[PDB]
Enzyme design. Structure first.
Site, short mmCIF file in Angstrom:
data_model
loop_
_atom_site.label_atom_id
_atom_site.label_comp_id
_atom_site.label_asym_id
_atom_site.label_seq_id
_atom_site.Cartn_x
_atom_site.Cartn_y
_atom_site.Cartn_z
N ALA A 238 -2.20 -15.65 3.98
CA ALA A 238 -1.28 -14.68 4.56
C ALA A 238 -0.82 -15.12 5.96
O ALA A 238 0.36 -15.42 6.17
CB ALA A 238 -1.96 -13.34 4.62
N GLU B 45 26.48 6.07 0.67
CA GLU B 45 26.68 7.25 1.51
C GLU B 45 25.95 7.09 2.83
O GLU B 45 26.54 7.22 3.90
CB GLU B 45 26.15 8.50 0.82
N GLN C 140 0.87 -1.17 0.00
CA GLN C 140 0.00 0.00 0.00
C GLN C 140 0.91 1.22 0.00
O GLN C 140 0.74 2.17 -0.77
CB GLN C 140 -0.88 0.02 1.26
N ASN D 234 0.51 6.85 3.85
CA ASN D 234 1.28 6.38 2.72
C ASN D 234 1.81 7.55 1.87
O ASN D 234 2.94 7.50 1.38
CB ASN D 234 0.43 5.44 1.84
N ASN E 217 3.78 4.17 12.40
CA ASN E 217 2.42 4.43 11.96
C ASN E 217 1.64 5.40 12.85
O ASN E 217 1.05 6.35 12.35
CB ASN E 217 1.65 3.11 11.84
N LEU F 188 23.41 5.98 -2.11
CA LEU F 188 22.81 5.12 -1.10
C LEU F 188 23.88 4.66 -0.16
O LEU F 188 23.70 4.71 1.05
CB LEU F 188 22.14 3.88 -1.71
N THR G 195 3.16 -11.70 6.13
CA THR G 195 3.92 -11.66 4.89
C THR G 195 5.00 -10.60 5.00
O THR G 195 6.01 -10.68 4.32
CB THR G 195 3.01 -11.31 3.70
N1 LIG Z 1 1.88 3.15 7.04
C1 LIG Z 1 1.20 2.08 6.77
N2 LIG Z 1 1.14 1.08 7.65
C2 LIG Z 1 0.38 0.02 7.21
C3 LIG Z 1 -0.32 -0.09 6.00
N3 LIG Z 1 -0.98 -1.29 5.92
C4 LIG Z 1 -0.71 -1.89 7.04
N4 LIG Z 1 0.12 -1.16 7.87
C5 LIG Z 1 0.61 -1.55 9.20
O1 LIG Z 1 1.39 -2.75 9.05
C6 LIG Z 1 0.89 -3.77 9.95
C7 LIG Z 1 -0.05 -4.69 9.23
O2 LIG Z 1 0.55 -5.80 8.58
P1 LIG Z 1 -0.56 -6.76 7.83
O3 LIG Z 1 -1.30 -6.01 6.81
O4 LIG Z 1 -1.38 -7.39 8.91
O5 LIG Z 1 0.30 -7.86 7.21
P2 LIG Z 1 1.32 -7.95 6.07
O6 LIG Z 1 2.61 -7.50 6.72
O7 LIG Z 1 0.88 -7.28 4.86
O8 LIG Z 1 1.50 -9.57 5.81
P3 LIG Z 1 0.47 -10.77 6.30
O9 LIG Z 1 0.40 -10.85 7.82
O10 LIG Z 1 0.93 -12.17 5.88
O11 LIG Z 1 -0.85 -10.37 5.68
C8 LIG Z 1 0.12 -3.04 11.02
O12 LIG Z 1 0.99 -2.64 12.05
C9 LIG Z 1 -0.47 -1.88 10.24
O13 LIG Z 1 -0.71 -0.78 11.13
C10 LIG Z 1 -0.26 0.98 5.11
O14 LIG Z 1 -0.80 1.04 4.00
N5 LIG Z 1 0.54 2.05 5.56
MG LIG Z 2 -1.45 -9.08 3.69
#
Ligand SMILES: Nc1nc2c(ncn2[C@@H]2O[C@H](COP(=O)(O)OP(=O)(O)OP(=O)(O)O)[C@@H](O)[C@H]2O)c(=O)[nH]1
Ligand SMILES: [Mg+2]
Ligand SMILES: CC(=O)O[C@H]1C(=O)[C@@]2(C)[C@H]([C@H](OC(=O)c3ccccc3)[C@]3(O)C[C@H](OC(=O)[C@H](O)[C@@H](NC(=O)c4ccccc4)c4ccccc4)C(C)=C1C3(C)C)[C@]1(OC(C)=O)CO[C@@H]1C[C@@H]2O
Ligand SMILES: Nc1ncnc2c1ncn2[C@@H]1O[C@H](COP(=O)(O)OP(=O)(O)NP(=O)(O)O)[C@@H](O)[C@H]1O
Ligand SMILES: Nc1nc2c(ncn2[C@@H]2O[C@H](COP(=O)(O)OP(=O)(O)O)[C@@H](O)[C@H]2O)c(=O)[nH]1
Ligand SMILES: [Mg+2]
Lengths: 424, 317, 408
Positions: C72, C227, C14, C201, C179, C225, C118
């Protein structure tokens, strides 16, 4: 990914009609019709519940198990009843006696092989299988006995794929049957040792939540069922949708079960407001957590306020701020630090889909793993002993080829299950 | 009380200069150093401790109590090449290289016929494995699952487990040879013995007081835990590596809770797995339990030995 | 010269779609132009699908979009070992197929979300398999480590104490963006209680643009980099600096935009603007890489920084005389046409290693114990090809990361 629903017994069946009544509309699938889907997203993931044959006929991939014809012949002779491929109907024209023993050892045991047969035809459908959905009531034959067998077999055939169980644990106040604790204690036993996610619903926890949280004055069964089916849609199907932070059965499982028992949850829906008036729209979000986390509104009988939580999974599904979501959850975790168990820094498992329930703006399914459900198996377990002691209607079990040590077994097991849950 | 005893196996000359070298520093007779570690626990047996010596401290008391009608458990753990096979059985007939099970068998038949004049003994042995969390009887291996039932007190026991009489040491050895020949062992090189199935050897000391018709039934469970390993990666390997990883981890985890509950913590994960139903008579009532942990120098053994160290160490500290 | 990027985990994807957006946006390459230079990994199809269905749909090759229709699982183990394994090969293949096509590269900017399935697990072995296949490069992993109080997953720490220990001995420089501590910025420095993930994001999507994008782009004081890691890590631990941006002003509310250097630089050290809940509660900086972009006079900097070097209340480490890598770029930032980012003509994306994280790690480690102390969701990993080892032995790991960040 995929799943294959299982309508064990009448109840589990009656509900099938409601779970599919819903889900379909939440996927634009008319009786035998196809995808009329108002959108295009309610299709990229359907597979989870259907199969491609014709090109307009995506047939629900569930199983209809029951030893009472009339039932399935009411579900198959009504509305959406004509969407299931007949192959799905695994009937047992026998005497669907209200005995756990009659549908687990004597009568059901026969009809089983002719079921597993199909549960394999559906599993070996295509792609990759995730798990199976199981609906039934722990207060009858075709439900607790035969359905509790269906799983004991399923869990031997694919100890990999998951097993969500939707049980209608025997409501307190009044029992819609007499041996109830017999058929129950015996099925919970099988549950605590096969399925790995159980969502216990109470016909009277619903009434309440349906007669006071929905000024609804004549809550027919169809309704209760309908409400329930509303939650099981938020759970599964839902997460099989996109989301800023999406999960899926496993996440739900791997975040909710600290200890292998399997543990049972208590589902709760979000916007649960009466039709006209109430349509307050106070659904910014604090309103949903307000909802979900209150005592009443927990499809379970017991009240959370009566015991800590181990895990919680607010599976929201409607565009919202990963901030106003992730945030709220916190205060909630601090205003009630009291009951929320401590050895888990973040009990809550925030989940967030995107598309909401067809006609609604914002909802959020709640799947709580609270220690409160201790005070229910207690109940059940009590009723047993009080009647077991005198072997009440035991001759209907033994006389069906059962054991005096079988009942002992279950109670204890399920009885110990109460114990453990207190350990937290 | 549950006591934890570390046993280091010695290196042989062929491996002192192959690649395997000492990592275990011993201090006194109860501390073992490894990187960071200022105390160990109750006792560490050095790479100079006899089979006889391990047997005296660990099993001799447990056998004595079993003959008076009590329970006892001896658990065994240690990975590949750690010395498990050498401690539990050793060689079947060796005058001092013999293990735990042949010594118990010798002590049992030295009291019998020297102290039987009102006691009528029946020594019943049963041998089963837990493989894919199913109880496979090893006296008939067409059995792929076997069930528990409950006794008079509502405590489970393995019904249908094939038991046999043994009245001299030889018949005990013949049961071991029979069970090992169908034990699930990974085909490695001939030297390595990679146990993928946990073994429970039951010695049921039944003695009958023929005058009053009072029966005693002491259970000695010798539990060979295969244990949780330093092995390679899985996810595209169709070996019995993935299958074993799930068994060894589930059983070691239940392990952790069981010592923690023995050294204190409200009752909990009983009836969770078949192992924990078999050893139910041994755990919670009047029982004694010894966990014998092995681990050679060969650097990988550091993994399982640290596992056996932590099983111990969490509890007493 | 180049730097591949592997966005792992829904989140990392994302954020990826975001950082990837800002890019073309400031390079005049609309929907369908050239060809990216990265990949996308996830064990949940529906998310990478969003890059296959939504915007920036055809700007990618269905080849740099890896998915495992399977599951996942918000658990390290499964994602690292069991499942995640199956995909890795294939994954690598692209970062070996995309790594070849280029011309003398510099490394792989990895994008993952510490506390995921993941994101934590998988990468763990991805970065793992990289440190061996290209030890001779840069491994800067851009992480989004666990919100200090607003975590999501119930297990989060299990997944983050595990992605840290396995990646630690493999990364070059690990950037960190918290976050939650970013939300504050959206509440306090932009005003909006309606921050969609799509915003955070856009933000990292900004701070990141200041790292690679513009830097790998000519300027008056270029910074490679390499650097970074050189001027940024004092010690082999894949040290984790923090990302910070300066003109985080709202493009609607207030408007003092014209905030000469002298201002935007001071706005970096105030703790309420650093995309990380690691408020310099005591953490002495030990090296900062002030990347500026836009209209900036080197003296303005070699003065604005001087003023700072003598504020003392900003206490820098001892063993470090001067720890200020001044990176000057030309082209000013480039704000989304109509998001909520001000749009100034100069910014300061300062990142740094601060003895501060001594905290953040601490507070995240403690978490872990509490649960491990009861095994909590342990059966979920064990049954996934892990052991009491990997946990206990990855705990001890970080332990010496609490001592490390303490001793240095
Ligand atoms: N900044 C930001 N943090 C995100 C975003 N999506 C998820 N997170 C954070 O990342 C973590 C979520 O990870 P998940 O989406 O559960 O899992 P994943 O790392 O994609 O992999 P799986 O567990 O196998 O699905 C949480 O701490 C969320 O707050 C995003 O788009 N932006
Ligand atoms: Mg995922
Ligand atoms: C004009 C208007 O907005 O009407 C609403 C409405 O008035 C309310 C009261 C609905 C209404 O629901 C009930 O009255 C109800 C009846 C029996 C059992 C349970 C609930 C509604 O019937 C339900 C219906 O729900 C949906 O459309 C969802 O997609 C829902 N669908 C079904 O349950 C369903 C019903 C019939 C046939 C097929 C599906 C759903 C929820 C979760 C997961 C999947 C689907 C909605 C918003 C309304 C009406 C139509 C009046 C409410 O319920 C739901 C589940 O949304 C009750 O409290 C909420 C708040 C809603 O505002
Ligand atoms: N004290 C000892 N004296 C002589 N040889 C020994 C001793 N301990 C172990 N060995 C030998 O070293 C090897 C380790 O034996 P065992 O076969 O005892 O290992 P484990 O049982 O440690 N192995 P594994 O089952 O694969 O996990 C065998 O060749 C033994 O005969
Ligand atoms: N919610 C709900 N409960 C039901 C329905 N039908 C029966 N029940 C409940 O199920 C129990 C009776 O079991 P039953 O379903 O008749 O068993 P079976 O048909 O022999 O398998 C009672 O507690 C009822 O309240 C239903 O359609 N919805
Ligand atoms: Mg051995």
């Amino acid at each position: 990914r995929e799943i294959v629903h299982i309508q064990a017994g009448q109840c589990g069946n009656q509900i099938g009609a409601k779970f599919w009544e819903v889900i379909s509309d939440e996927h634009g699938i008319d009786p035998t019709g196809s995808y009329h889907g108002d959108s295009d997203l309610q299709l990229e993931r359907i597979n989870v519940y259907y199969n491609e044959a014709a090109g307009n006929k995506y047939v629900p991939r569930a199983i209809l198990v029951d030893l009472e014809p009339g039932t399935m012949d009411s579900v198959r002779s009504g509305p959406f009843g004509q969407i299931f491929r007949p192959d799905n109907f695994v009937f047992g024209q026998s005497g669907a006696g209200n005995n756990w023993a009659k549908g687990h050892y004597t009568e059901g045991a026969e009809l089983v092989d002719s079921v597993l047969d199909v549960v394999r035809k559906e599993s070996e459908s295509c792609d990759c299988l995730q798990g199976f959905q199981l609906t039934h009531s722990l207060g009858g034959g075709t439900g607790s006995g035969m359905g509790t067998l269906l799983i004991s077999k399923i869990r031997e055939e694919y100890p990999d794929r998951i097993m969500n169980t939707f049980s209608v644990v025997p409501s307190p106040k009044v029992s819609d049957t007499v041996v109830e604790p017999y058929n129950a204690t015996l099925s919970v036993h099988q549950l605590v040792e096969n399925t790995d996610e159980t969502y216990c619903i109470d016909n009277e926890a619903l009434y309440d939540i349906c007669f006071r949280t929905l000024k609804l004055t004549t809550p027919t069964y169809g309704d209760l069922n309908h409400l329930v089916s509303a939650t099981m849609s938020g759970v599964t199907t839902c997460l099989r949708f996109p989301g800023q932070l999406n999960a899926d059965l496993r996440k739900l499982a791997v975040n909710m079960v600290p200890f292998p028992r399997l543990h049972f949850f208590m589902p709760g829906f979000a916007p649960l407001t009466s039709r006209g008036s109430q349509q307050y729209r106070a659904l910014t979000v604090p309103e949903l957590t307000q909802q979900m986390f209150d005592a009443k509104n927990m499809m379970a009988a017991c009240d959370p306020r009566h015991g800590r939580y181990l895990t919680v999974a607010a599976v929201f599904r409607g565009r919202m701020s990963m901030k106003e979501v992730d945030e709220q959850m916190l205060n909630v975790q601090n205003k009630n630090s009291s009951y929320f168990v401590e050895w888990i820094p973040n009990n809550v498992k925030t989940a967030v889909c995107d598309i909401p329930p067809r006609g609604l703006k914002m909802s959020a399914t709640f799947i709580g793993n609270s220690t409160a459900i201790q005070e229910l198996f207690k109940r059940i377990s009590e009723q047993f002993t009080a009647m077991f002691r005198r072997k009440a209607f035991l001759h209907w079990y033994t006389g069906e080829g059962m054991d005096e040590m079988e009942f002992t077994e279950a109670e204890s097991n399920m009885n110990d299950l109460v114990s453990e849950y207190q350990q937290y | 009380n549950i006591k934890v005893m570390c046993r280091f196996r010695p290196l042989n000359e062929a491996e002192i200069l192959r690649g395997d070298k000492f990592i275990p520093k011993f201090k006194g007779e109860e501390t073992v150093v490894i990187q960071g570690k200022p105390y160990v626990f109750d006792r560490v047996l050095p790479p100079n401790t006899t089979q006889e010596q391990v047997y005296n401290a660990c099993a001799k008391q447990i056998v004595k109590d079993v003959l008076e009608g009590y329970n006892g458990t001896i658990f065994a753990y240690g990975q590949t090449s750690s010395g498990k096979t050498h401690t539990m059985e050793g060689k079947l007939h060796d005058p001092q290289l013999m293990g735990i099970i042949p010594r118990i068998a010798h002590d049992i038949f030295d009291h019998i016929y020297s102290m039987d004049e009102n006691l009528e003994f029946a020594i019943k042995v049963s041998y089963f494995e837990i493989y894919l969390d199913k109880i496979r009887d090893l006296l008939d291996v067409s059995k792929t699952n076997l069930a528990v039932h409950e006794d008079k007190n509502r405590v489970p026991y393995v019904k249908g487990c094939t038991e046999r009489f043994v009245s001299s040491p030889e018949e005990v050895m013949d049961v071991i040879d029979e069970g090992k020949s169908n034990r699930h062992v990974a085909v490695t090189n001939m030297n390595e013995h990679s146990s993928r199935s946990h073994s429970i050897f039951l010695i049921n000391i039944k003695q009958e007081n023929v005058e009053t018709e009072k029966k005693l039934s002491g259970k000695l469970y010798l539990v060979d835990l295969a244990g949780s390993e330093k092995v390679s990666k899985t996810g595209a390997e169709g070996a019995v590596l993935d299958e074993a990883k799930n068994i060894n981890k589930s059983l070691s985890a239940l392990g952790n809770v069981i010592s923690a509950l023995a050294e204190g913590t409200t009752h909990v994960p009983y009836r969770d797995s078949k192992m924990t139903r078999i050893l139910q008579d041994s755990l919670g009532g009047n029982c004694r339990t010894t966990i014998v942990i092995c681990c050679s120098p060969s650097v990988f053994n550091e993994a399982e030995t640290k596992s056996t160290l932590m099983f111990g160490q969490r509890a007493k500290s | 010269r180049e730097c591949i990027s592997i966005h792992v985990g829904q989140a990392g994807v994302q954020i990826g779609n975001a950082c990837w957006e800002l890019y073309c946006l400031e390079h005049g390459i609309q929907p369908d132009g050239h060809v990216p230079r990265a990949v996308f990994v996830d064990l949940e199809p529906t998310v990478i699908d969003e890059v296959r269905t939504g915007t920036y749909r055809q700007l990618f090759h269905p080849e740099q979009l890896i998915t495992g229709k399977e599951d996942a699982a918000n658990n390290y183990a499964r994602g690292h070992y069991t499942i995640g394994k199956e995909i890795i090969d294939l994954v690598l293949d692209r970062i070996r197929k995309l790594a070849d096509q280029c011309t003398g590269l510099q490394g792989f900017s990895v994008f993952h979300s510490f506390g995921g399935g993941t994101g934590s697990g998988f990468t763990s072995l991805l970065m793992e398999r990289l440190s061996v296949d290209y030890g001779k490069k840069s491994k800067l992993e851009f992480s989004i480590y666990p919100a200090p109080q607003v975590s999501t997953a119930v297990v989060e720490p299990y997944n983050s104490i595990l992605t840290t220990h396995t990646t630690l001995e493999h990364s070059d420089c690990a950037f960190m963006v918290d976050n939650e501590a970013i939300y504050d910025i959206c509440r306090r420095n932009l005003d909006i209680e309606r921050p969609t993930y799509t915003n955070l994001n856009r933000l990292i999507g900004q701070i990141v643009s200041s790292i690679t994008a513009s830097l790998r782009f000519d300027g008056a004081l270029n910074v490679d980099l390499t650097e970074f890691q050189t001027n940024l890590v004092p010690y082999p631990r894949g040290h984790f600096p923090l990302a910070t941006y300066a003109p985080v002003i709202s493009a609607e509310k207030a408007y003092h935009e014209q905030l000469s250097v002298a201002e935007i630089t001071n706005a970096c050290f105030e703790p309420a603007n650093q995309m990380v809940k690691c408020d310099p509660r005591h953490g002495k900086y030990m090296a900062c890489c002030l990347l500026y972009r836009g209209d900036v006079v080197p003296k303005d900097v070699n003065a604005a920084i001087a003023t700072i070097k003598t504020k003392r209340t900003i206490q820098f480490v001892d063993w470090c005389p001067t720890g200020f890598k001044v990176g000057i770029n030309y082209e000013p930032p480039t704000v989304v046409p109509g998001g909520d980012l001000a749009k100034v003509q100069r910014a300061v994306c300062m990142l740094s290693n601060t003895t501060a994280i001594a905290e953040a790690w601490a507070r995240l480690d403690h978490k872990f114990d509490l649960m491990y102390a009861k095994r909590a969701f342990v059966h979920w990993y064990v049954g996934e090809g892990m052991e009491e080892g990997e946990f206990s032995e990855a705990r001890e790991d970080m332990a010496a990361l609490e001592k490390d960040y303490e001793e240095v």
